[PDB]
Amino acid sequence: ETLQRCLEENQELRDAIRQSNQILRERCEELLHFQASQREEKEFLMCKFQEARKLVERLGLE
Amino acid sequence: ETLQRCLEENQELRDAIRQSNQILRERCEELLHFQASQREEKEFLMCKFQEARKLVERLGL
Amino acid sequence: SEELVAEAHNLCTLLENAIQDTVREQGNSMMNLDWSWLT
Amino acid sequence: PAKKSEELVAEAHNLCTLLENAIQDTVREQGNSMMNLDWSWLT
């Protein structure tokens, strides 16, 4: 008889899915925030490349 | 019948788990590669921006 | 459950999207800019 | 060969922990910002 084994496994599997769901929720929230951080530093470094290029151009002239 | 019912839900929960596992293994691999690109971009930009600093220092003189 | 099974496919879809747009903006790398004014 | 329930449950736990840590490290590492360096040589 295999119903007991089936019901036990169904329980363990639902608990596996429940737990990963929870982790997936927390982890995506973190990623969405990361996407903003990544674009702030993007634009800050681009700014600094530009300023740096300008300055160098100017000292070269003298 | 309680057996057929259980077995059918056992297969569906086993299909949900294999598939989600496939995705997590693809997503982790993707994320490991992005991490390595991020680290290289940063080493690149820290280098450029240190060369820029030294080239500025070097001109003032 | 299968509220669970549906919740997992949706969590996964969100995950794949999130990583796709995290791993996207990377594609425009400042390695492709003109750094030759250094040299 | 079709994985056992136990085996599926354990891979999922493995892959979950691997994803968390892969995500937290990504979030953490970039948070050592090039915005925290000394940029004052620029004026």
Tab-separated table of C-alpha atoms in Angstrom:
chain	number	residue	atom	x	y	z
A	1	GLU	CA	0.000	0.000	0.000
A	2	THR	CA	1.365	3.347	-1.282
A	3	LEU	CA	-1.193	6.078	-0.418
A	4	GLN	CA	0.604	7.010	2.845
A	5	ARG	CA	3.937	7.412	0.882
A	6	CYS	CA	2.116	9.539	-1.673
A	7	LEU	CA	0.539	11.827	0.933
A	8	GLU	CA	3.851	12.210	2.786
A	9	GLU	CA	5.635	13.109	-0.459
A	10	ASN	CA	2.885	15.553	-1.454
A	11	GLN	CA	3.351	17.271	1.853
A	12	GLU	CA	7.180	17.462	1.561
A	13	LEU	CA	6.843	18.800	-2.017
A	14	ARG	CA	4.342	21.507	-1.068
A	15	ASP	CA	6.673	22.609	1.695
A	16	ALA	CA	9.576	22.722	-0.816
A	17	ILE	CA	7.485	24.940	-3.127
A	18	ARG	CA	6.196	27.124	-0.295
A	19	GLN	CA	9.764	27.844	0.947
A	20	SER	CA	11.270	28.574	-2.436
A	21	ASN	CA	8.283	30.896	-3.233
A	22	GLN	CA	9.116	32.885	-0.093
A	23	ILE	CA	12.834	33.103	-1.081
A	24	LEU	CA	11.955	34.018	-4.663
A	25	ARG	CA	9.725	36.848	-3.307
A	26	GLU	CA	12.445	38.324	-1.125
A	27	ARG	CA	15.131	37.973	-3.773
A	28	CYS	CA	13.211	39.669	-6.619
A	29	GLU	CA	12.446	42.673	-4.362
A	30	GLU	CA	16.233	42.979	-3.885
A	31	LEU	CA	16.917	42.768	-7.626
A	32	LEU	CA	14.414	45.530	-8.490
A	33	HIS	CA	16.196	47.762	-6.011
A	34	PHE	CA	19.513	46.766	-7.423
A	35	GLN	CA	18.313	47.943	-10.888
A	36	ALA	CA	17.927	51.497	-9.597
A	37	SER	CA	21.370	51.431	-7.810
A	38	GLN	CA	23.011	50.201	-11.020
A	39	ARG	CA	21.547	53.072	-13.063
A	40	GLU	CA	22.530	55.775	-10.469
A	41	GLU	CA	26.196	54.720	-10.566
A	42	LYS	CA	25.975	54.367	-14.422
A	43	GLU	CA	25.060	58.023	-14.669
A	44	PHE	CA	27.514	59.152	-12.003
A	45	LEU	CA	30.487	57.497	-13.756
A	46	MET	CA	29.473	58.811	-17.166
A	47	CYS	CA	29.445	62.249	-15.616
A	48	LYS	CA	32.959	61.740	-14.253
A	49	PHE	CA	34.280	60.324	-17.624
A	50	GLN	CA	32.987	63.546	-19.233
A	51	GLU	CA	34.420	65.937	-16.673
A	52	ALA	CA	37.668	64.011	-16.810
A	53	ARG	CA	37.862	64.219	-20.642
A	54	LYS	CA	37.102	68.033	-20.428
A	55	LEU	CA	39.763	68.706	-17.798
A	56	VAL	CA	42.382	66.703	-19.749
A	57	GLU	CA	41.491	68.542	-22.980
A	58	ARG	CA	41.945	71.827	-21.156
A	59	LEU	CA	45.287	71.096	-19.492
A	60	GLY	CA	46.625	69.826	-22.873
A	61	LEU	CA	45.785	73.312	-24.286
A	62	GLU	CA	47.329	74.603	-21.057
B	1	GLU	CA	-10.760	7.402	-5.451
B	2	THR	CA	-8.169	8.868	-3.026
B	3	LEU	CA	-5.223	7.048	-4.682
B	4	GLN	CA	-5.704	8.339	-8.288
B	5	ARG	CA	-6.279	11.809	-6.810
B	6	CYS	CA	-3.017	11.779	-4.859
B	7	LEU	CA	-0.896	10.316	-7.566
B	8	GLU	CA	-2.169	12.963	-9.977
B	9	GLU	CA	-1.269	15.756	-7.521
B	10	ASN	CA	2.092	14.053	-6.914
B	11	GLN	CA	2.974	14.253	-10.624
B	12	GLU	CA	1.856	17.903	-10.856
B	13	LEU	CA	3.873	18.937	-7.813
B	14	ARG	CA	6.855	16.953	-9.270
B	15	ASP	CA	6.442	18.862	-12.578
B	16	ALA	CA	6.273	22.203	-10.808
B	17	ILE	CA	9.508	21.405	-8.970
B	18	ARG	CA	11.596	20.028	-11.938
B	19	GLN	CA	10.661	23.086	-14.010
B	20	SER	CA	11.344	25.654	-11.336
B	21	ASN	CA	14.654	23.864	-10.660
B	22	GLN	CA	15.588	24.130	-14.330
B	23	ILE	CA	14.904	27.897	-14.216
B	24	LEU	CA	16.873	28.402	-10.985
B	25	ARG	CA	19.799	26.604	-12.411
B	26	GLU	CA	19.680	28.774	-15.612
B	27	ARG	CA	19.142	31.985	-13.565
B	28	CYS	CA	22.004	31.275	-11.140
B	29	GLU	CA	24.368	30.577	-14.020
B	30	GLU	CA	23.326	33.815	-15.705
B	31	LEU	CA	23.799	35.659	-12.443
B	32	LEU	CA	27.259	34.186	-11.836
B	33	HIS	CA	28.348	35.356	-15.298
B	34	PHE	CA	26.951	38.893	-14.672
B	35	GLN	CA	28.875	39.026	-11.474
B	36	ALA	CA	32.082	38.260	-13.288
B	37	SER	CA	31.315	41.017	-15.929
B	38	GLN	CA	30.517	43.490	-13.221
B	39	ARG	CA	33.862	42.780	-11.500
B	40	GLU	CA	35.751	43.262	-14.828
B	41	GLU	CA	33.940	46.540	-15.742
B	42	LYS	CA	34.790	47.839	-12.310
B	43	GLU	CA	38.496	46.843	-12.585
B	44	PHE	CA	38.404	48.521	-16.005
B	45	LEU	CA	36.899	51.745	-14.737
B	46	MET	CA	39.077	51.911	-11.587
B	47	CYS	CA	42.084	51.570	-13.933
B	48	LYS	CA	40.942	54.363	-16.367
B	49	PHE	CA	40.027	56.621	-13.589
B	50	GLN	CA	43.460	56.062	-11.880
B	51	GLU	CA	45.256	56.764	-15.189
B	52	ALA	CA	43.108	59.906	-15.579
B	53	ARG	CA	44.062	61.026	-12.071
B	54	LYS	CA	47.798	60.490	-12.727
B	55	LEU	CA	47.541	62.295	-16.095
B	56	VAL	CA	45.892	65.290	-14.422
B	57	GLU	CA	48.508	65.248	-11.624
B	58	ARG	CA	51.194	65.043	-14.317
B	59	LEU	CA	50.020	68.091	-16.256
B	60	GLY	CA	49.813	70.640	-13.395
B	61	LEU	CA	53.638	70.465	-13.256
C	1	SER	CA	-1.754	23.890	-3.930
C	2	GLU	CA	-2.161	24.425	-6.890
C	3	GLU	CA	-2.364	27.970	-5.638
C	4	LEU	CA	1.261	27.059	-4.801
C	5	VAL	CA	2.011	25.680	-8.258
C	6	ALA	CA	0.617	28.834	-9.866
C	7	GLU	CA	2.429	31.075	-7.393
C	8	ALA	CA	5.727	29.393	-8.211
C	9	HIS	CA	5.425	29.838	-12.018
C	10	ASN	CA	4.730	33.521	-11.399
C	11	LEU	CA	7.598	33.953	-8.939
C	12	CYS	CA	9.823	32.336	-11.590
C	13	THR	CA	8.547	34.636	-14.370
C	14	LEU	CA	9.275	37.718	-12.245
C	15	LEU	CA	12.708	36.315	-11.445
C	16	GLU	CA	13.540	35.754	-15.153
C	17	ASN	CA	12.315	39.261	-16.084
C	18	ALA	CA	14.229	40.924	-13.138
C	19	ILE	CA	17.495	39.198	-14.093
C	20	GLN	CA	16.903	39.947	-17.754
C	21	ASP	CA	16.753	43.686	-17.115
C	22	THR	CA	19.630	43.525	-14.518
C	23	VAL	CA	21.773	41.631	-17.084
C	24	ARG	CA	20.594	44.026	-19.861
C	25	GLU	CA	21.875	47.534	-18.850
C	26	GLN	CA	25.291	45.821	-18.479
C	27	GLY	CA	25.226	45.489	-22.328
C	28	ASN	CA	26.043	49.209	-22.627
C	29	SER	CA	29.498	49.046	-21.090
C	30	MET	CA	31.775	52.021	-20.628
C	31	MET	CA	34.496	49.822	-22.028
C	32	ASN	CA	33.078	50.851	-25.449
C	33	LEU	CA	33.709	54.559	-24.935
C	34	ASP	CA	36.598	56.477	-26.391
C	35	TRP	CA	39.364	56.415	-23.783
C	36	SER	CA	42.110	57.458	-26.289
C	37	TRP	CA	42.436	60.973	-24.795
C	38	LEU	CA	44.305	59.156	-22.028
C	39	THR	CA	46.991	58.267	-24.502
D	1	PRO	CA	16.050	8.013	-14.456
D	2	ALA	CA	13.184	10.002	-12.856
D	3	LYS	CA	14.376	11.723	-9.654
D	4	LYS	CA	12.862	10.655	-6.292
D	5	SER	CA	10.597	13.240	-4.344
D	6	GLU	CA	13.459	13.496	-1.719
D	7	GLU	CA	15.957	14.287	-4.517
D	8	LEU	CA	13.765	16.975	-6.094
D	9	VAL	CA	13.204	18.568	-2.680
D	10	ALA	CA	16.894	18.617	-1.946
D	11	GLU	CA	17.927	20.082	-5.420
D	12	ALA	CA	15.353	22.869	-4.927
D	13	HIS	CA	16.811	23.662	-1.499
D	14	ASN	CA	20.312	23.635	-3.016
D	15	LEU	CA	19.390	25.850	-5.938
D	16	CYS	CA	17.462	28.296	-3.663
D	17	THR	CA	20.463	28.851	-1.314
D	18	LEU	CA	22.763	29.199	-4.386
D	19	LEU	CA	20.332	31.870	-5.796
D	20	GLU	CA	20.082	33.810	-2.500
D	21	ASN	CA	23.752	33.968	-2.035
D	22	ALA	CA	24.333	34.788	-5.724
D	23	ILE	CA	21.860	37.589	-5.365
D	24	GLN	CA	23.029	38.973	-2.030
D	25	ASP	CA	26.682	39.023	-3.235
D	26	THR	CA	25.638	40.919	-6.415
D	27	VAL	CA	23.744	43.489	-4.317
D	28	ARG	CA	26.656	43.717	-1.770
D	29	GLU	CA	29.641	43.940	-4.194
D	30	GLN	CA	28.172	46.796	-6.320
D	31	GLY	CA	27.442	48.595	-3.011
D	32	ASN	CA	31.159	49.227	-2.760
D	33	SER	CA	30.476	52.189	-4.972
D	34	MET	CA	32.894	54.061	-7.176
D	35	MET	CA	30.849	57.013	-5.788
D	36	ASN	CA	32.850	56.641	-2.522
D	37	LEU	CA	36.223	57.302	-4.032
D	38	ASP	CA	38.056	60.677	-3.879
D	39	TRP	CA	37.014	62.571	-6.979
D	40	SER	CA	38.452	65.868	-5.827
D	41	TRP	CA	41.473	65.693	-8.110
D	42	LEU	CA	38.788	66.733	-10.616
D	43	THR	CA	38.816	70.237	-9.088
